[PDB]
Design a protein around this ligand. Structure first.
Ligand code: HEM
Ligand code: HEM
Ligand SMILES: C[C@H](O)[C@H](O)[C@H]1CNc2nc(N)[nH]c(=O)c2N1
Ligand SMILES: C[C@H](O)[C@H](O)[C@H]1CNc2nc(N)[nH]c(=O)c2N1
Ligand SMILES: NC(=[NH2+])NCCC[C@H](N)C(=O)O
Ligand SMILES: NC(=[NH2+])NCCC[C@H](N)C(=O)O
Ligand SMILES: [Zn+2]
Lengths: 407, 411
């Protein structure tokens, strides 16, 4: 029942009781661990709403109060009457912040309580969605001084009137398959980039074409929109020593804004809930830039450094990797754009974890996602045992809309 | 039931059915994953079924399942168990067992080599001096003047739990660690407790930063005895850098033979509490963990200073830059001295090929992602992008409590 996690670098042992409140499954069993797998009714709703409201009133020190009982009956009546219910603004804010607090794969949760919540539940059309999104982008970007935020559109009703942001992130680059058989731009977005074309977008066919927003409101067909270029902050990447680095012509955007996940609060499902914070260096420098399936730029950079790429044991890939990440961080910092390196971010997560254990009795964490993609063991989280479990409110994965939409 | 795993870099999807032959638990449940947790005398009753399962596996491997030889062996073992409460493995079954324990080790990235293991049968051993002799022979054989050969030495199995054979060292070759009164540590911090035990047992410590520890050996449940491994049998490599001439002046070196000696080997229900095994190093084990862990030699700063990196702020990634150079030095040194070693790129690439082969010929390959992915440059190695399934198959290597915590001293 009571589990303990130890840090093998400090010997610090923490006891976890919070997992005892876990509701959803993990995918693992007593016979098999799937820890490395990426994607492992009124009668149903009231229980979920009750669980949520109970934690909410408990958080505001009014558990078992008349107000608690009142709201709890009001929702029951509303569900029985409308087969669903609406959250109070206070509950919505609490729920979104806690979905982040509960995100086991997020290393920056020390920032969880500082989240700007934009209530877009009054939205009805795709143009309205575009407007809300532009405002979120402008607010969150804040001229480089990034501020975490989330915009919440109308909750699911009958599943045939769902709001959805077809993009995977508010801001991403297009990808096109060239005759050469090679891919131009970001291979990760090749399919989405084609759907935009299939819709009318005039692809400039560059290495970094900021994709258009494909917005779906109330279940209708998605519409394109070009985010005001003036609102998309980008950072040209240059190295603080290698003047030839700028010649690679690489750049990245400052705002990471996941837009394809589903926010679940008190049983309610918000299928369109774009959220953003700020980047951890490795996300761009290691994954976006060096993944073989992404921009895959290691070799190019290696050649420019004149490294011995004849043998893997020369560790040329590793040397180049470091340089590419020093640059990314240097570029963002030079342009005054918020960004955090993997050492600072992991150190903060450890602190957060400790705070969470002594104040909440635990902190669900997915080691596989928390440990940075480079220099793993020189960051504190590598040596930190973690318990992964699912707590709600939560951010969940959901099927891409183009594989479920009925035009 | 079929379970699929996908490699997100190649989209290759594999199907696992081997997990169905898994018996042991993992530590996880449908409500909680313990995938990052380091460490989540039998009776006749539970022993014959374990023997049968193993013998069935053995006879199937040699294409003699159901044969008279198979049936007679099962009968022979059954009689032996009811007669003596235990049983002895035939040499062939011991070899098959040891190789499969390696084949089944989910945390081992070098398993492509599993079928190539020299098994030394030391079940006739009765004393600590006998254990020392066997261990010297293992080290000399395995070292092979730098051309490392994988090997395992298997001492007598557990009987009543009061006559266990144990190698108290965690590895046959390791450096001593000494806690100074000022709170600092001389040598390898990971071995301070064991070093103190050795000193107490009579070892005269030279108190240097790289002193090869003596062997502390326990035979037949008796108190352990100290032995010094012949220096001429301990191969070491001075660490230097191909471009930085000052690197050698850090006074660093390491031993060439990694020989884990504190695990338990379970074969057909039998427990071999003393079963030292060795292969060869993957660079990062030394360059990343042994040298750069804050709790080990912790050399990142001293190296970073010499390279004169901007140690003012972490965003300069000086720790990362130094880490790479140290690992370059480790590989370069071993290669230059002609001592077998594999870099993490080569090792993980081979593991992926091995894993795919296992899925196709065996129906699976249990693997612990947390341990398989190297401690540096994780995502630039293929294993990072490979989904894995972790489950426990026997024969297997298991952890066991340190002997000093359970041993009943006879004095
Ligand atoms: C303040 C800055 C923040 C930092 C530095 C941070 C950092 C990270 C990192 C490095 C990852 C892994 C990304 C990947 O590998 O694809 C991650 C994942 C995630 N973060 Fe955070 N995060 C921040 C803000 C946010 C915000 C504002 C939310 C929600 C309101 C959030 C929710 C999540 C979730 C749900 C995931 C997993 C997404 C997935 O499964 O693909 N994060 N975060
Ligand atoms: C031939 C070269 C070999 C290589 C390159 C290799 C590499 C590795 C590495 C990198 C680890 C992780 C070590 C750590 O993080 O402490 C490991 C673990 C392991 N290997 Fe291998 N290995 C090899 C041979 C062997 C042999 C001969 C056996 C057994 C017959 C074996 C059994 C295991 C086991 C059981 C573990 C886990 C140990 C633990 O839990 O502490 N390995 N191996
Ligand atoms: C197969 C494996 O689960 C996959 O490559 C995971 C590993 N860890 C990760 N960690 C983070 N932060 N992000 C990812 O996309 C991944 N991918
Ligand atoms: C807490 C966490 O499980 C621990 O630090 C693990 C992570 N991965 C590892 N991987 C290897 N190969 N060796 C280790 O000792 C560890 N330690
Ligand atoms: N820090 C964040 N909020 N990240 C969200 C995911 C961004 C993704 N890892 C990327 O590199 O584009
Ligand atoms: N390749 C091996 N057989 N390794 C065994 C473990 C060695 C241990 N990681 C060390 O650095 O000493
Ligand atoms: Zn698990």
């Amino acid at each position: 029942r009571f589990l303990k996690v130890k840090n093998w670098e400090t010997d610090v042992v923490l006891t976890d009781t919070l997992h005892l409140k876990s509701t959803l499954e993990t995918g693992c069993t007593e016979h098999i661990c799937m820890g490395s797998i990426m994607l492992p009714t009124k009668d149903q709703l009231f229980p979920l709403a009750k669980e949520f409201l109970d934690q909410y009133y408990s958080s505001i020190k009014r558990f078992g109060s008349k107000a608690h009982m009142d709201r709890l009956e009001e929702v029951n009546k509303e569900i029985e009457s409308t087969s669903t219910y609406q959250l109070k603004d206070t509950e919505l804010i609490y729920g979104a912040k806690h979905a982040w607090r509960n995100a086991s794969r997020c290393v920056g949760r020390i920032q969880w309580s500082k989240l700007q919540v934009f209530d877009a539940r009054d939205c009805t059309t795709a143009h309205g969605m575009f407007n809300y999104i532009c405002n979120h982008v402008k607010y969150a970007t804040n001229k480089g001084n990034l501020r975490s935020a989330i915009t919440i559109f109308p909750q699911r009703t009958d599943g045939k009137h769902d709001f959805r942001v077809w993009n995977s992130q508010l801001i991403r680059y297009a990808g096109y398959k060239q005759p050469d058989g090679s891919t131009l731009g970001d291979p990760a977005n090749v399919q989405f980039t084609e759907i935009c074309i299939q819709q009318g977008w005039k692809a400039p066919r560059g290495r970094f074409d900021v994709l258009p927003l494909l917005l779906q409101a109330n279940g209708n067909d998605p519409e394109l929109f070009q985010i005001p270029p003036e609102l998309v902050l980008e950072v040209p990447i240059r190295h603080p020593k290698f003047d030839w680095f700028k010649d690679l012509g690489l750049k990245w955007y400052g705002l990471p804004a996941v837009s394809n996940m589903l926010l679940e609060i008190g049983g309610l499902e918000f299928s369109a809930c774009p959220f953003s914070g700020w980047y951890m260096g490795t996300e761009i420098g290691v994954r976006d830039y060096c993944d073989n399936s992404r921009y895959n730029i290691l070799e190019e950079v290696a050649k420019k450094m004149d490294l011995d790429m004849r043998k893997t044991s020369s560790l040329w890939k590793d040397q180049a990797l470091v340089e590419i990440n020093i640059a990314v961080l240097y570029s963002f910092q030079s342009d005054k754009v918020t960004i955090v390196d993997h050492h600072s971010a992991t150190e903060s997560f450890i602190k957060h974890m400790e705070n969470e254990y002594r104040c909440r009795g635990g902190c669900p964490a997915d080691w596989v996602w928390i440990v940075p993609p480079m220099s793993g063991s020189i960051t504190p989280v590598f040596h930190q045992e973690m318990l992964n479990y699912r707590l709600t409110p939560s951010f969940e994965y959901q099927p891409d809309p183009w594989n479920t939409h009925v035009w």
